[PDB]
Amino acid sequence: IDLGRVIGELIDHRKLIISITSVFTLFAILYALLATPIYETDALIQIEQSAPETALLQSRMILGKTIDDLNLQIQIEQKYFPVIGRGLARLMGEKPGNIDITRLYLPDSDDISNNTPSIILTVKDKENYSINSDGIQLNGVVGTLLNEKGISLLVNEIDAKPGDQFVITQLPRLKAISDLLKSFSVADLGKDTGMLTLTLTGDNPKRISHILDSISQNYLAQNIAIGNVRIIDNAVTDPNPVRPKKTIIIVIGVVLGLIVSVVLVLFQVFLRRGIESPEQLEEIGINVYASIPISEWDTLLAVGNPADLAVEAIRGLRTSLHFAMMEAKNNVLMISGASPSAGMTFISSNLAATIAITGKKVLFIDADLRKGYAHKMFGHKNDKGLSEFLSGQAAAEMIIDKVEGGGFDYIGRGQIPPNPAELLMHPRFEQLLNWASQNYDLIIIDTPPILAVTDAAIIGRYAGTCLLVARFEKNTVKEIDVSMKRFEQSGVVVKGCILNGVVKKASSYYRYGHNHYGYSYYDKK
Amino acid sequence: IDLGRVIGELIDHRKLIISITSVFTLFAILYALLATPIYETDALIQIEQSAPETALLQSRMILGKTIDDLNLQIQIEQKYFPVIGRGLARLMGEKPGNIDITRLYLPDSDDISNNTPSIILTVKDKENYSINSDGIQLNGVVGTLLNEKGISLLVNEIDAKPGDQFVITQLPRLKAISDLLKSFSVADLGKDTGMLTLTLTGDNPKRISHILDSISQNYLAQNIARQAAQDAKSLEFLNQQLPKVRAELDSAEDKLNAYRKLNMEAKSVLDQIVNVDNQLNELTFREAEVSQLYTKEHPTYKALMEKRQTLQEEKSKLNKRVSSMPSTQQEVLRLSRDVESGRAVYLQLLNRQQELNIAKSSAIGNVRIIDNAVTDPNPVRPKKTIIIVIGVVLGLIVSVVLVLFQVFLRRGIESPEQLEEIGINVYASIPISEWDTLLAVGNPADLAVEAIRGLRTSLHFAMMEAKNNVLMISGASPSAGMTFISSNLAATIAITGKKVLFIDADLRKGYAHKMFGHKNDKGLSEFLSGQAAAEMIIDKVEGGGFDYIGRGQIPPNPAELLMHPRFEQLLNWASQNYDLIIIDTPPILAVTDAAIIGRYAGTCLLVARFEKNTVKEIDVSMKRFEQSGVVVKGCILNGVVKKASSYYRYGHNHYGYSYYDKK
Amino acid sequence: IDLGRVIGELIDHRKLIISITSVFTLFAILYALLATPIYETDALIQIEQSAPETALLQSRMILGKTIDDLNLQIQIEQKYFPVIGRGLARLMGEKPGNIDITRLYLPDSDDISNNTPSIILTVKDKENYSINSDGIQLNGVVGTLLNEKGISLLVNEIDAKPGDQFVITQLPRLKAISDLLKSFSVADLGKDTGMLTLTLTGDNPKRISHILDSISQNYLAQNIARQAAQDAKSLEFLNQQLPRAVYLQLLNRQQELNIAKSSAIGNVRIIDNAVTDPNPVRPKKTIIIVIGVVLGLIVSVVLVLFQVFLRRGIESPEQLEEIGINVYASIPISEWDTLLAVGNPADLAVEAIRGLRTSLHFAMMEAKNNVLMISGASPSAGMTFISSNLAATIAITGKKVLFIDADLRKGYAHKMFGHKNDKGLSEFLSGQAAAEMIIDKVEGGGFDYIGRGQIPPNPAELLMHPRFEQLLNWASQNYDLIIIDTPPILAVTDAAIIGRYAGTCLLVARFEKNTVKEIDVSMKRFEQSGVVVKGCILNGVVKKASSYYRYGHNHYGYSYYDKK
């Protein structure tokens, strides 16, 4: 692999790379916007040490006293149904509602697992509200305390709009202490100075500053009730959130999308075996006679769009065949796919059309007695196709039908017989070929793939020329070689191959200095 | 790839390299010349340790005093419309105008995000000015304070030319402290030494030294008041006053609760008066401290009573506004004023007690300011020289990687050597002519015409021992110069006294008829489709000497017209009247017409384009011709350009010398 | 590459190498002898610490007191127009004049263009002088102060010659402190020890020692003042506390504090006062010259290496013979309108052409006819020099030689031999001249020549006329050898047309200018047109040691005569 191969592969998969990278960046931006901003407050404390002050500041004594003072065991969360509701609600601009609760006793359900009782409060106005723990509806009022259903609850100053729901949890005191301890940090900036820097993170900037001030003053009061701790700086909140770090999140999104795109591209590059250029077949010693491009398009393409790029390639194939087919036993050309859906009847029918327009009589036999659909494609008197002639119940003149937008006669397969391979072994097939080799200038035979069924091997003994049809990416070089060796093993010589369905690729161009797709050539008018 | 290869590539792509490098250095130069200069000031403080003092100097407590005295919450920015207007105005010598604001209080929106209210002040003269917060136009005069629409402002000593605009922000005290702290630095410099090296950076050299002087003197006066605080009565005074103020606050809170158990203008004037009361109380305490540690005739004390008189006038106006509003909201406003002023005084006295307690128990005695703050007039940023150097180096690296990519990603033919390696005979390398008449006729002394004459002499030797005198010339891709080559070759072989017929068998995009002047009726199409004879389709080129057959009208079936026996009849007839027939044919990788025609031509030549075709393309064309029974004699490389990379990779550039007597 | 190759390359390029190194060294000596010498003074301070005293010495307080004492805000520079006038004036022995200014007050415009005001003082005699700020001339005298135009100046002791100019700048005190601090350096020789080394650099050896003594004395006075301030504060408190045993005790304490206050000498000791080192510390001339020499050598070697690796021209006949191109001669450079073979028959290039003639006699037998077409690869390859001199050397041997100049585009053999320029080869080809009107006699020659004639508009198509072949067939029986001169084949096609009629064809390759691939391309382009080039003549060979060490031979040839 070289630089040109790498860049060509990247250019080919530029849609996949761009899509995957943009999906990753979209997810990163969606996270950075919808992630709740977590703020930071800090306070400065002077010690006259600082090793035991840290362990006493984070003790459950100070922290629990702070929680008791500020009633931090009453958790209130405005209710948004998804994991994205809070973020987008902040993004639009709706101010998040808060209700001040000072006295809360839930019935202490204290079941096997859920140690934290929780209710949902629904705001009905600025004045009254409703409560539902487990569907039990209660109606309450700001001011007047509520003592009903094992519920004691005191709301002051509801600040929200009606319809808002709030999950209100009475979490245990140690859970609250652990929650405070998780976001509270004590450090010493100088490592030798008496100063301690207290830090608290949280989503509500005012609440965390109040909490850190309370921590500072609880520590101060504990010391005084003596070695003079003094509060240098009270807690103030940085208004810029410290998390989420939007820029690094987006950058990691972009970089990770690039890495995933690149690794998928290399997996696809090293895991594809199909044909990529005619050079791959010509290395094996196989003569490629045309590389037919993809046509973006029941009429024949060589008729509904004679100026199409694929029809031009097929004309090139016709001129190759006029030279390859001389010094052949007869005017019979057997076209065989390598695999099903190799685009082989497309090629044979359009080749019949382009050879017919040159003033030659062409007969298109559809000897795919298993899945042949030429009759469907050309319109049809479906009775008396090839099977009926082979099984003895038709004459040669009764099975030939003329294509309207054609110029070539054709013979349909007929009814799908139960024994397609054994009808073709009848001498009537060779009699039909010998008869048609006098009334027609060219006979093109449609055959099933040789790696599926043996029918093509039987038919190809009576064919002067035999051409395989490969699909551009679907068929492998080894499939073509296996097909030609299986033809040889049965006494049939494949003259060469027709690569079909070629698409424009930069990897081809850089790997093999030609892409093999072909130029468009007309004066635009 | 060797040294000569790389040198040749650099020489060839010198234009791209120079342009990219010059663009990068231009960007670096304009950045270094337009970025705002950042000056640095430094002081030297002597300490009688010093790590607690380094951490206490950078505390919000010490810095907040500097924001309070120097009004650092009033941000004034001279308004330049672009991101570069300030720098280019500095370059043109326009002195940055400045205005002095001693009192600014905005309507204090406090929305979700914009915590910093902003207004725009336009200068009209040396005396009056205009203001527009949110489109509301106001007219103010320096001196006389302005109280309008919940906006209090006092602008003094305006020193800008008329028409100058300024963005005035009242950024919050904590934001002011953060901005100050981000640019402030304190270092002991010895670890034992009492020597503290304070530094401060900023874009105004006169202002940062005032800030650093304020910081140094704040810390100095703090440590001095530490010595006199031990015996001072202020401690006991605060210890007695704080319970009284707390009791008054509790009484006010109880009264507010009893009365409770939202007019826009009422709340706005309440906020105005609360702010005025905070400023007045803080100014009273600052006046006391200054009168203790400074003199009355000191300029600071003069600023103090001037600001006090200003605040008193503002409070009087606010009280007059209150007296005009109905008593129903007046009662609520008075209760709110009492509660908020009690809270403010309680907080201020708590801060006073905190500062006094911190001052008292400081082990450090005499502190002395050795070097007052002085600003280095050479900006510390931008570092112009390194900026321009990085610009040059970055431009060079970018140019080198672009050139390396374009060298490793190119596949087009670089010399006839590439073709002749594959066993393809090149018969001429036609150069690019900088120049509707034929080049071989308009400029018979051209360089490309000389190459084409060489091609003529090479063809006379190639075309001997051929089947006939028919020469088919086919491109490899469109726009390979195939018709240029064939037409000028007909022009050169014509002047040698030979009868040349130029058939244009490109029935798809043939334009030789337009290029030679057209009796376009009865072209090759009409003859092929049977509606014309040979004698009526041959025309004569005026500046030529060779006859030509045009394509005619574009048929719907060019490849099927060309297979007619009429084409071979025409060629067999013309091969007896003419010494040479040259046929213009479409490319073989586009259509198959050339493959059909080449069966009737005794010699066939492909025209490759210099950089636009690949060697693999030429080989694919020759093999596609061979597969149809046409044998391509060789190739004509076309459009060659002079390249040093050819001269170092191969020994020859294949471009060709110019040879005439210069006159 | 090997040792022999690089040695030969340096030997060949010795002129470039020596010239580049010489230019670099002249730059080095010019810089070393014109850069202003910088002297360094040193003083020794001992502390009985050492970390804060270093920062105190370099503080704006001590330095500012020094500048106020010595008036360092007045900067005086002798005026020389170039960046080299001062250096050359020092070289010529001109003692630098100085003026002593004790009081200066400039108008202090302090505008954006000029922050520090400046005037120019022109010395007219030992006493009087003139001043111009921005063109306004004012006359002053030593002694009598000048107070005019918002300018006050007191100049004392002018020591200079008349016509000397001095740029006098008034520096802001902070700028003077910045300048002083830049050159002043405090160090601790022990890194812990109380010993402090003070150094100061500058272009005036006496001034820097005065400044460093001022700094040291200000620092010492400040240090002893600190001990005296505490002692005087204690004494002042005792005196203010004076109201009988306590009275006598306080009197004794007052006397003790007086004696301790006056005994100032304390923490700082000035061991060495500043003295200037007479040898300037900068510019370090010898190392500068060494760097200049080495840099010139490196630059020369790099340029030589680039020229060696980027040259593609022919360097020996063996390069051509590697492909299989027969080289029949290598013609050296002749150091030299008459022919070389006639003006200087004993030249080295003419001897090489004689060797070529004897080689050609063998090469040209079994050829179709006696026609020899000589073509170049490039113009200016020496085609006509070789052709004409070869014709001369073959004509002195008593053979009929016809020299045809078939270069119809830039042929100048007629201008070389002297010309009856009418009826050249073009005129014969154009149909308007006979064969016999175009042949002319070379005067100092011995061979006939046919000039090209008037430059035709179609040189390549005239040569295609059968008249040309008729002329060759006719001349092939009236002459023993026809030498035809053509344009180069990589320029035009005329040589390929003419080579159809020549029995022998030879390419002339210029020694350094042409490339081996160029000669191969030329021969293959000849073959493609049915013309077989017998071989090559390398021309313009020069003597090179790189060839002698790379190849076993230089291919330039010996001179061979008996010197008398």
Author numbering:
A (entry chain E): 17 to 64, 85 to 261, 406 to 477, 494 to 721
B (entry chain F): 17 to 64, 85 to 297, 304 to 477, 494 to 721
C (entry chain G): 17 to 64, 85 to 279, 385 to 477, 494 to 721
Q: How did the manuscript describe this experimental structure?
A:
Gram-negative species couple polymerization with translocation across the periplasm and outer membrane and the master regulator of the system is the tyrosine autokinase, Wzc. The tyrosine autokinase domain forms the cytoplasm region, while the periplasmic region contains small folded motifs and helical bundles. Autophosphorylation of the tyrosine-rich C-terminus of Wzc results in disassembly of the octamer into multiply phosphorylated monomers. We propose that the cycling between phosphorylated monomer and dephosphorylated octamer regulates glycan polymerization and translocation.
Previous work showed that mutation of K540 in the Walker box abrogated Wzc phosphorylation. In contrast to phosphorylated and enzymatically-dephosphorylated protein, purified non-phosphorylated WzcK540M was homogeneous, oligomeric (based on molecular mass in gel filtration) and yielded discrete octameric particles in negatively-stained EM images. A cryo-EM structure of WzcK540M at 2.85 Å resolution was determined with C1 symmetry. However, C8 symmetry breaks down for part of the periplasmic region, so local C1 refinement was used to complete the structure. In contrast to motifs 1 and 2, motif 3 (268–402) is not well ordered in the C8-averaged map and working in C1 identified three discrete structural arrangements. We designate the three possible arrangements as class i, ii and iii. In the most common particle, class i is found in three monomers (chains A, D and F) with all motif 3 residues visualised; this permits an almost complete model of the Wzc monomer. Class i is a four coiled-coil helical bundle (α8–α11), composed of two helical pairs (α8–α11 and α9–α10). Only a portion of α8 and α11 could be traced in class ii (chains B, C, G and H), where the helical axes are arranged approximately parallel to the eightfold axis. We were unable to identify any density for motif 3 in chain E (class iii).
